[PDB]
Amino acid sequence: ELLPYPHQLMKRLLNRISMQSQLIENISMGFLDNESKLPLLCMETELERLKFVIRSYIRCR
Amino acid sequence: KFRYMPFSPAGTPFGFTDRRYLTMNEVGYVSTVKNSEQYSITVSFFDVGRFREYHFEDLFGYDLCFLNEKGTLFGQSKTGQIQYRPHDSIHSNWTKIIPLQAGERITSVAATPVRVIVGTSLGYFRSFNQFGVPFAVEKTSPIVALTAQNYRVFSVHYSQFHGLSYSLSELGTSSKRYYKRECPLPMSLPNIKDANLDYYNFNPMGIKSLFFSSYGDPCIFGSDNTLLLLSKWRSPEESKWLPILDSNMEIWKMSGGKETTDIHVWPLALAYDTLNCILVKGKHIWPEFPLPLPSEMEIRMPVFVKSKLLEENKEIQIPVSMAAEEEYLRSKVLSELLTDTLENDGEMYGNENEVLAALNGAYDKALLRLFASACSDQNVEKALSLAHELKQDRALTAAVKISERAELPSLVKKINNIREARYE
Amino acid sequence: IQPPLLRPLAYRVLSRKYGLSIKSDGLSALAEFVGTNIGANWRQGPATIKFLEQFAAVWKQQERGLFIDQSGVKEVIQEMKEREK
Amino acid sequence: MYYGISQFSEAYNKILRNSSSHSSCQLVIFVSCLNIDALCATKMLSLLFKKQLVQSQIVPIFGYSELRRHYSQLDDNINSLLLVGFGGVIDLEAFLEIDPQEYVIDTDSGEQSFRRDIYVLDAHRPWNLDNIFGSQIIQCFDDGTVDDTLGEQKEAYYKLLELDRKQRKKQIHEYEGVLEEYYSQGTTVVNSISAQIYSLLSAIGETNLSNLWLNILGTTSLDIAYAQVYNRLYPLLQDEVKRLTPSSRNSVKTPDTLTLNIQPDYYLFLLRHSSLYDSFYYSNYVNAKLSLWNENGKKRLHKMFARMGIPLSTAQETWLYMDHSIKRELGIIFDKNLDRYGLQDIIRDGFVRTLGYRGSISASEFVEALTALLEVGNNSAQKLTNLRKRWVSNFWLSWDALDDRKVELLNRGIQLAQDLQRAIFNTGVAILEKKLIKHLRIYRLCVLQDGPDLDLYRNPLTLLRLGNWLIECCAESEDKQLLPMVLASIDENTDTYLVAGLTPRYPRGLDKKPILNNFSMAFQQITAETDAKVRIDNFESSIIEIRREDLSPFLEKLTLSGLL
Amino acid sequence: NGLDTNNLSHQEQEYLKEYCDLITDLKSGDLVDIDLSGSLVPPSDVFIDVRVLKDAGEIQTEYGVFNLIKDSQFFVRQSDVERLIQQGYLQKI
């Protein structure tokens, strides 16, 4: 059975993903202009995993 | 009689192996490998980001190795040759020979950010600057071990007539001071199985390691393996040694009553409230050339009775009251040490003050558990003494609630009077 | 005009949108098209997106960034925008 | 000179400062394809760059013209360019027509900085004085032997560059004489590129057992060409193996257990992988000593086996399948019989790296498998370009086989090496019987029209292998004068003879400075003078491609040339 | 299509084109941040060595142009090379 759609949780996660992507883009601009890209890679991998989970759930729905 | 041999912290004898750890510390573990009688030297660094490992063959085979973040010290006790290599090595690795009389050998060495420390079996002491310029030449009791945490310096002097002794000093960049001078050391030397005898031949004192704490407080791991720490060292009059950790008792308790001989304990450094120590297994006391990750063990008081623990055993079990007593004692000692460190050395990190507050809360909780135990004993005097020992009046509120749970009118009245006094 | 500045922008707007390869020369040609407007032409960004969509609909070919066909497609999309005006 | 051996790690740090960015891949690496030492050095450099996480590109190159065409397509985002095993002897700045002023950025402050920096590495000791000194974008790497030899050369060169009167004429003549004495000298390799990379990794402290094995493989590749340099390097490799050797010894066998072993490695052909008799048969030194190309030599080998007392069938049986006790007795049998036959030079020491159940492998057999993979890993100018792409694919295949997980690829290389060595031995015996080599007294001339292995010798590796077999025969033969040798094989499709110079060498028992190679400059002068087409695009100047009809007049002009 | 016309019926081909348009439209708008056409394999490897299965030539990246010359290896993050692998131009380093 299809589960009821949690709109609030999905929207909050999407907003967090958008803010994280914007912050990563700002950090990329600053780097292109401390200087350690390991945290940026960690954030990018976290965003990729979260987006993959969300897309998998949406595709199953 | 006593045999004078070079001493390197966490040093490992070659033994059967051609290679051995020249010295080991939190800054790094140095291992020398014999190569056609020219022992190749490798200097590993635990902080990979801060320092890059460098390995160099050594024809000298310097038997003394000291490691500090500013630079690595190397010394050949018999020849007197001493080489100091800066970790950055931007300054050239200076080397020199010290005047060693017939029968004189370097018992230990120590490194300082601006100075180099040298001690001899004959007791002659030579001070040299970071550039190798000899800043002082002196004679003292034979400094069996030398330890220096940055500017702070802690050494152990010993002789058959002088006995066990230790000198503490905070030289600094300037205004050199000796907090203690050859003060007697309350430690027991090992009796002089075959592997332990070989380890005694390598280190006649039997000290597994002599090292300052992460905060800089003096510490040492004796042959008895019961860790000792110099509490209140900032005030020389009130300074006192503390058997903060009994490694044998900890090993037995973790074994659950089993007595294991192959297991051992080998400390490289002591983090705050936790010892970074490798637990060597097998016959050899010293660890093998491959380095297992150090075992982190929190400080444990020796107040636990092995007979009582065995009676509980009938994986070891401890009485709740005994656990509360040990917890309160450890928390009080840790709070005093943290107060001294924050007052004098300040805070290297801002979390230390919050940790001290949480430790005070935990000490109050242990005192409340002991107060409940005294309530079970129905000794109102003992319960009131515990409540008076309680640090916080907010915890005294819980103490008064516990007294009401004990339904002792005298304890409740005394707790109310104590509440009024604390409000005053 | 400012091909380096538009390069991440063109790369996103094209490759993320369709999987189409964008040559550096094609990005430079799009930069010259953007610089045809004296100031920054933010609406021309959506115009370039529409041009890429029309190119995918008509040519339906990968590696559209070679710009030999993309320049003619840009002229076609510009004529379409002129007809829309 | 421009970068000291101790300063190699500093140059690597500068490369990191220039091209190290998670945002962009700003590094590019160029390696001469079909070069074993360059391949090992590039593998070590790629591992170091992977540890550094700096993104980069690797493109194998076959010739100097290919290198120039690759430089034409360089991306400006790449701020650093690396060369491995090539370009040192030549003035790469003159070849590529590079302009430091065009490249220099923020030249002022007395600091030189360029948008793209070119780092050069080459095994050959000779290096163009302009390459070492004139070009700043070029940053030559040397072991210090170049600096020691070029102290006077650099003094004279700088004095000549400064100088523009009869006394001034005398000074300029002295400078020109010093420069010319440095010039017109046969190229020779004095150090391995893998050895230089290992020295840089030691300055960084990054050297490990795998990197030491790679450097040992590069030195082993050099060994046949320069046994003297191999002897100079072998004690250093042994010292490094001792320093990096694990403390545990005689460890219990398990697949993970890995170590490098300094053990005897007899001069035989894949003795671990080939039968004992066949390993003796395919050994160039064994053939050159016993005259095995003759049936008398084969019978002498059989008599030697009989004197050793091993059954001839036991020797001919696969070495892996041979009896366990005979394997242990083989060392004593060699010590007894090689002295009897005078072939005691066959006994030799070589590093053999082991990994548990995967077992030990000698550096010589590994290098042979790598050379076989390079040779056979897979409009005439277009066909040559496709063949160069196939050579780059073979280089990539050998690089993949360098990975320990590709042990099957290494085994395929070993089988290809067995086949290639068999073909080389057959061709060499046939050439000895045919007397195709001619003692012209200016050089030794040999031209191949045989159908078999001509397409293989079109590959320079196989051509050089056949030349090395013939050179071993001539060196062991005392009557044969040590003279430069010319080997010319032609592929029918291209219809062009691949002529490569071959310097004479002393017999393996002998160990005298190696003969310098005049073939490079001789072929350059002969190509400039003769109308016959000759190709110098390949990184090896001695190797040259000339049309089938073009070769004979070119050969006459070569005999006429005074450089040979 | 997210990244054999004779076998399909004409109506089936129109339906497949409509489905591809619907997929592109679903990615085009809300939830555009994540490429819905992106691979459903979990991101097990952040970085993976990549080299050309085919000599396609220059290729785009986040901030770089990489030549795909035959048998040319690379070291890059798996996410950037995922599209190139979907193209089939580069396989397993």
Added chain:
Amino acid sequence: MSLPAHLQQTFSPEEIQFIVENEPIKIFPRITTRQKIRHTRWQLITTDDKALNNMVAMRSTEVVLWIALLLKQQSKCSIVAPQWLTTKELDRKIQYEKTHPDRFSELPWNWLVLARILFNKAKDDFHDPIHELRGKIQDLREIRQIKVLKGLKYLNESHLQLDNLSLLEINELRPFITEIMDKLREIHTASLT
């Protein structure tokens, strides 16, 4: 369709590995990410950033297993071996399984996947030799497989209970057991009036 046919019923082994990676694990850092009172930050949205930013060299800390392995790819991280992943604990579990053929030893549901991943990467961190742990894991797997065979011999349509069974074993057994039980339930329902 959006869901692969094999994935319609059970999770893939890679998906189970991803879940195990989502689990946390202790490790020893080698970088003083914590800054003294006298810098890039993780700022993770799905996991704690404070632990990573407070990591110091040789200071044991716990983090999600995927991030732990990512750091272990660098020399800075050394994973802490699980206590149950010790030779003595494995021998205890084997003895428990031998004494209780019916009752599985209380291994974690991801015991097999975690042991395999650690053997792939964390083999160096093990103080005990990796080969002995691998042999003990194989023995425990064989014992659990024999117990699973007996349980399949004792299947029932109503329900089943598998307390200490590995998550990977449950995922592997899901298709066959689910199909067999569903077919038996359908047969019983058709038999029902």
